[PDB]
Amino acid sequence: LDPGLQPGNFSADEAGAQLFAQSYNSSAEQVLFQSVAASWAHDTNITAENARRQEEAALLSQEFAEAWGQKAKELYEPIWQNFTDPQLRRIIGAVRTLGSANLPLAKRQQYNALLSNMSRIYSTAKVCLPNKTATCWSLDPDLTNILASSRSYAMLLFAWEGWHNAAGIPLKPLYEDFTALSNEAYKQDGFTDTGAYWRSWYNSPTFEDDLEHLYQQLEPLYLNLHAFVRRALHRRYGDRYINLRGPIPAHLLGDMWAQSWENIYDMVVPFPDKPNLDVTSTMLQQGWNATHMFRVAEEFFTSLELSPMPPEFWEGSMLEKPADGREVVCHASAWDFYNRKDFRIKQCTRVTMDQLSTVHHEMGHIQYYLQYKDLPVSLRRGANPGFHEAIGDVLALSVSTPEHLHKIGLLDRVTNDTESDINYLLKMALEKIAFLPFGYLVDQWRWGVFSGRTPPSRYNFDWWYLRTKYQGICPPVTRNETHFDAGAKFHVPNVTPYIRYFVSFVLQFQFHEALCKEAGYEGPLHQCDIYRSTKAGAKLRKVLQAGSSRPWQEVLKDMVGLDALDAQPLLKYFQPVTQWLQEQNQQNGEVLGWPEYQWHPPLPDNYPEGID
Ligand SMILES: NCCCC[C@H](N[C@@H](CCc1ccccc1)C(=O)O)C(=O)N1CCC[C@H]1C(=O)O
Ligand SMILES: *[C@@H]1O[C@H](CO)[C@@H](O[C@@H]2O[C@H](CO)[C@@H](O)[C@H](O)[C@H]2NC(C)=O)[C@H](O)[C@H]1NC(C)=O
Ligand SMILES: *[C@@H]1O[C@H](CO)[C@@H](O)[C@H](O)[C@H]1NC(C)=O
Ligand SMILES: *[C@@H]1O[C@H](CO)[C@@H](O)[C@H](O)[C@H]1NC(C)=O
Ligand SMILES: [Cl-]
Ligand SMILES: [Zn+2]
């Protein structure tokens, strides 16, 4: 690289191990800005030129990272861990770990290539109809909408199978190779496999257990939401397609991965004939740009005594699927350019409630950025990945309240009663409860792939073991070890850790409680709305401004009063419907779980030649 980016020498002393770092930070944000802006061009525009570029920028970083990497350890290793200012012993500790950059040049290029590609294969795939080579559907929007609102078994089946073959099969060979490399890289940095490296980020020698336990506490919650919906579904598709004693077919839950069922609310809503808790409809009625959405999400944040979106963001941002036709990574994501000036969001936005919360979710990342920019490089990265995924969801909780919505125009009217209360709680259950199993499962599968528990020889066989086992869902068509359904999930191909969405979902309520308390709210945790609460917001920002400077376990105590993750405040949120569902299944003689595992639905009638 430039040499004015290379280390320099420093002292084997602390007062000079600190001098090692003030430097790295000034240089690092040049090298980081580059690699980041490069990607921003590849994702905003997926072209061979941009990809080759991106792969280049990565190569620079990879060895900017090696230079200071091997240097930081050259002389700061056998004494670190005894550094008075550990808010620093942990920056040096972040630098001493390179990862891939401990990979010979050839392998690094292989590495970066795989990445570029997988994301391309994943984001480029499509589903085409049989006889008519007529317009081929894409995951967003076509496929998504078909799942979100089509009630044709066969049709959903065509898209579920279409997408899973189309995205997975080609992806498999690359994945196996990316894993071998990723491993090799961190086997250097001390860990055993990338798995261990990924879960060393919560600093809890007890992490996995704490999670397994925390799940048991919630499993009952899921199992009941499950049997309840499974039966509402039986009601609509019949006895041939649904088994009241078996796992649910993975394509009927209204979402490609069956990770959230809030899109079938109209089929399970307990007390219908009441005001609809779905302004998935009056957002359209009104006159709503995709921008209008990033504007309302904004306005909550302001009110919350927190900074608004910078002007750079408002323009260095992609909030709609472009018109120049430029194949893009439509996923929603938030970008931190490490230059304290450029922060943007990338997402192919269009007008659904479901996505109006995703917008908040994303703003949560941006707001976290804006808040901790004023610290070093090797800690921007918050308490733990969990806290990051939480920030926007918390504020989302308050927004979802029917009552919060009326205050802002999408819930015309009012009934502050039980029935409506149950409906609301069920809707939220479809979104947060139904996810818990999945969120847990994914990295469950991966830590095992990274560890060799699950060789490519059992990629799909161990994936459906986990899916059936936790979600109680089964594949609508047969599968084998030419398939790679794990790869059809945006996060597997783009190598993003998942166990943080679990942590996130459990700990977004701890926040919601803690915040509602300081807001001075009293009434029911699930009707609280920390709106316009400068008092609450100040409590949140203190955690934000903290980044990775001290331990999450401490930043958490200060904010919530607890040394760790707790499902208690979550149980307390859903309490009503928790008891309600439980009572309804029993009376209706339901069976919690799937004892008839191994059961699979039959294909439609002559598949595949239908309405599609
Ligand atoms: N309707 C699509 C929304 C996508 C939003 C969100 N995006 C992701 C982006 C992840 C990412 C990590 C590293 C590099 C590039 C991207 C996010 O964490 O915000 C997400 O994945 N989410 C949000 C909730 C659950 C999880 C998902 O759907 O699997
Ligand atoms: C796993 O299942 C797939 C089918 O979903 C099997 O593959 C074939 O499927 C294609 C259509 O996608 C048919 O044209 C082929 O005729 C099917 N092959 C056979 C042998 O019936 C696939 O073979 C199964 N894979 C393994 C490894 O057993
Ligand atoms: C580098 O990090 C320091 C904090 O030590 C910060 O003040 C600065 O803005 C960052 N970059 C530059 C060029 O100072
Ligand atoms: C990724 O795909 C490209 C073609 O775009 C190919 O040249 C390259 O070999 C693939 N990368 C790897 C690591 O296989
Ligand atoms: Cl994680
Ligand atoms: Zn996120």
UniProtKB/Swiss-Prot annotation:
Induction: Up-regulated in failing heart.
Residues binding Zn(2+) 1: H361, H365, E389
Compartmental location: Cell membrane; Cytoplasm
Annotated tissue distribution: Ubiquitously expressed, with highest levels in lung, kidney, heart, gastrointestinal system and prostate.
Assembly description: Monomer and homodimer; homodimerizes following binding to an inhibitor. Interacts with calmodulin (CALM1, CALM2 or CALM3); interaction takes place in the cytoplasmic region and regulates phosphorylation and proteolytic cleavage.
Membership in a protein family: Belongs to the peptidase M2 family.
Carbohydrate-modified residues: N9, N25, N45, N82, N117, N131, N289, N416, N480
Residue span, Peptidase M2 domain: 11-595
PTM entry text: Phosphorylated on tyrosine residues on its extracellular part, promoting cleavage by secretase enzymes and formation of the soluble form (Angiotensin-converting enzyme, soluble form).
Residues annotated as catalytic: E362 (proton acceptor 1), H491 (proton donor 1)
Top-level taxon of origin: Eukaryota
Protein name per the record: Angiotensin-converting enzyme
Binding positions for chloride 1 per the UniProt entry: Y202, R500
Disulfide bonds: C128-C136, C330-C348, C516-C528
Site feature location: Not glycosylated: N494
Disease annotated for this entry: Ischemic stroke: A stroke is an acute neurologic event leading to death of neural tissue of the brain and resulting in loss of motor, sensory and/or cognitive function. Ischemic strokes, resulting from vascular occlusion, is considered to be a highly complex disease consisting of a group of heterogeneous disorders with multiple genetic and environmental risk factors. Renal tubular dysgenesis: Autosomal recessive severe disorder of renal tubular development characterized by persistent fetal anuria and perinatal death, probably due to pulmonary hypoplasia from early-onset oligohydramnios (the Potter phenotype).
Cited function: Dipeptidyl carboxypeptidase that removes dipeptides from the C-terminus of a variety of circulating hormones, such as angiotensin I, bradykinin or enkephalins, thereby playing a key role in the regulation of blood pressure, electrolyte homeostasis or synaptic plasticity. Composed of two similar catalytic domains, each possessing a functional active site, with different selectivity for substrates.
More details: Inhibitors of ACE are commonly used to treat hypertension and some types of renal and cardiac dysfunction.
Effect noted on mutating R500Q: Abolished dependence to chloride, leading to reduced peptidyl dipeptidase activity
